[PDB]
Design a protein around this ligand. Sequence first.
Ligand SMILES: [Cl-]
Ligand code: NA
Length: 129
Amino acid sequence: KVFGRCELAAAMKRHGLDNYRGYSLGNWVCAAKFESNFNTQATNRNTDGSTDYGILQINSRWWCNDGRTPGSRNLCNIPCSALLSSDITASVNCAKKIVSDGNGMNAWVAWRNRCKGTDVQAWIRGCRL
Ligand SMILES: [Cl-]
Ligand code: NA
């Protein structure tokens, strides 16, 4: 599923991401924009052999099981395929664990490089929230 910007903002809000660990909704929508371009089906192989999955490009080295990442953990206790669903519940639940891991949203390199310090409120501007 390719979400609309405000459609994704509404779904992230319903699932409790709006100001989760102090990160406003625009931060989450900005991260999704540059990670996946709002595509739930996005996958990307990393140099280390891990893969990133879904709207927030969650990595198989720590967070989900894909059966092909040697030495990895599954700290969200989910198949990585669950992160590609049109229903973002699994991605949101796993993102809450990741953002709580100690470095906040710096866990998402694209958030640090393209969202951090920017006018992230622009990502929810015009949305009925
Ligand atoms: Cl933080
Ligand atoms: Na894994």
